[PDB]
Design a protein around this ligand. Structure first.
Ligand code: HEM
Ligand SMILES: CC1(C)[C@@H]2CC[C@@]1(C)C(=O)C2
Ligand SMILES: [K+]
Length: 405
């Protein structure tokens, strides 16, 4: 359904891309979004889909807009507008300087020093899950590893019950890839309703789990409010439950389809961190955006106050102007340019946890299960949204080719 073209938008800038159901999704979600970078598409276009909004298609524009928070506000960061308007997570819905006190508090719970302390725990959980799968000769990778590995690490960090995972994971997905059974507001309210009594319990108490630390943090010379805590904790849960979870599946699908790349890392382990970075570029997966605070001419295009602009983090590293042969995976790529973790003041706080989870997975998977493939005749289906994902990833292998460590 196409929203009527607003009178300020020139007809030659129209390109009706649907971010929740892109036309060429069957080729792969990154491929479907990369259609925006074909020779027929300008660098700044208007889609009539999803209520109508701008899209910037190039790394240069995406970086520029994410630096200019004065014009491009994070107050309404999701499309469609009703989702962006309800969106009140902290720190993302705030801009500088207000945002910074909350970023600093979130860094106490997910920052590099926290991640470094978690090294053995992350290692143990990967090794144990993978060893349990190893002799079986098959798995449903999404449910058998991609979900429980990062999610259980997050639930440990947050001190939340593993039994709550199915419910919380379903709710988070409604905010990024809704199935239509819940509104954005309904899903967010349910997440908040879950967190409210937990936060009340952990406030004015000495817990050192992530929720306790957030709930007892001091911001702006006073205790954080219950409401501020809930808005932060909800965002941490969405990050924990719907980011790495999807990325691992894109990466493992690629490795299943590309034996030469598996061989590269099995036989050259110190290449894994570089490989991680290249996969983060090639299988980038996030796309949110901003709202115009004022009428503004941007690269000759008249943007109106209140217009939404989608600034897909996914697209910068896929841009030929940032990386030659962008769809090729080259673990020896000379400069790996991307904005996979975002750009500007909102740059991902979870990035260190993410990289550790990815690197540990690559090393510990290929050590035990060096040779695997997609189940014969399976068609892998992707799904698109604020965060994109893989519907299912059935893998098979000969257990005789595996190694118990
Ligand atoms: C592959 C993994 C991940 C990717 C690709 C990713 C991507 C991103 C992106 C693109 C942004 C900026 C969004 C914007 O500017 O509107 C962001 C912000 C953020 N991420 Fe990550 N993320 C990942 C993992 C995580 C994890 C594991 C957590 C927490 C456990 C997390 C927590 C956050 C938080 C709290 C912000 C908000 C920062 C702010 O607004 O100041 N992320 N992430
Ligand atoms: C865009 C994001 C990946 C970033 C962290 C979780 C997410 C869905 C947000 O709402 C901000
Ligand atoms: K909002």
């Amino acid at each position: 359904n196409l929203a009527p073209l607003p009178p300020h938008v020139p007809e030659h800038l129209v390109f009706d891309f649907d971010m929740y159901n892109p036309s060429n999704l069957s080729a792969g979600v990154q491929e479907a979004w990369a259609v925006l970078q074909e020779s027929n598409v300008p660098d700044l276009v208007w889609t009539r889909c999803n209520g109508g909004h701008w899209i910037a298609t190039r790394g240069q524009l995406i970086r520029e807009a994410y630096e200019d928070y004065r014009h491009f506000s994070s107050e309404c960061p999701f499309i469609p507008r009703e989702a962006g308007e309800a969106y009140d997570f902290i720190p993302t819905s705030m801009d500088p300087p207000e945002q910074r006190q909350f970023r600093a508090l979130a860094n106490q719970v997910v920052g590099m020093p926290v991640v470094d302390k978690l090294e053995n725990r992350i290692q143990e959980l990967a090794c144990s899950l993978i060893e349990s799968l190893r002799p079986q000769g098959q798995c449903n990778f999404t449910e058998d590893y991609a979900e429980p590995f990062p999610i259980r690490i997050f639930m440990l960090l947050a001190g939340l019950p593993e039994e709550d995972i199915p419910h919380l994971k379903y709710l988070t997905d409604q905010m990024t890839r809704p199935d239509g059974s819940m509104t954005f507001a309904e899903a967010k309210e349910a997440l908040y309703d879950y967190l409210i009594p937990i936060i009340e319990q952990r406030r004015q108490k000495p817990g050192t789990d992530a929720i306790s630390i957030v709930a007892n943090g001091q911001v702006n010379g006073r205790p954080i409010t219950s409401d501020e805590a809930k808005r932060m904790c909800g965002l941490l849960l969405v990050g924990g439950l719907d980011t790495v979870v999807n990325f691992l599946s894109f990466s493992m699908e690629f490795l299943a389809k590309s034996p030469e790349h598996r061989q590269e890392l099995i036989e050259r382990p110190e290449r894994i961190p570089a490989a991680c970075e290249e996969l983060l570029r090639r299988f980038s997966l996030v796309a949110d955006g901003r709202i115009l605070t004022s009428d503004y001419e941007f690269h000759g295009v008249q943007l109106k106050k209140g217009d939404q602009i989608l600034l897909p983090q996914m697209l910068s590293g896929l841009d030929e102007r940032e990386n030659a042969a962008p769809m090729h995976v080259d673990f020896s790529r000379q400069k790996v340019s991307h904005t996979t973790f975002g750009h500007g003041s909102h740059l991902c706080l979870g990035q260190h946890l993410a990289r550790r989870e990815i690197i540990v997975t690559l090393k510990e998977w290929l050590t035990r299960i060096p040779d695997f493939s997609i189940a014969p005749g399976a068609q892998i289906q992707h799904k698109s949204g604020i965060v994109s994902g893989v519907q299912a990833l059935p893998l098979v292998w000969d257990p005789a080719t595996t190694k118990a460590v």
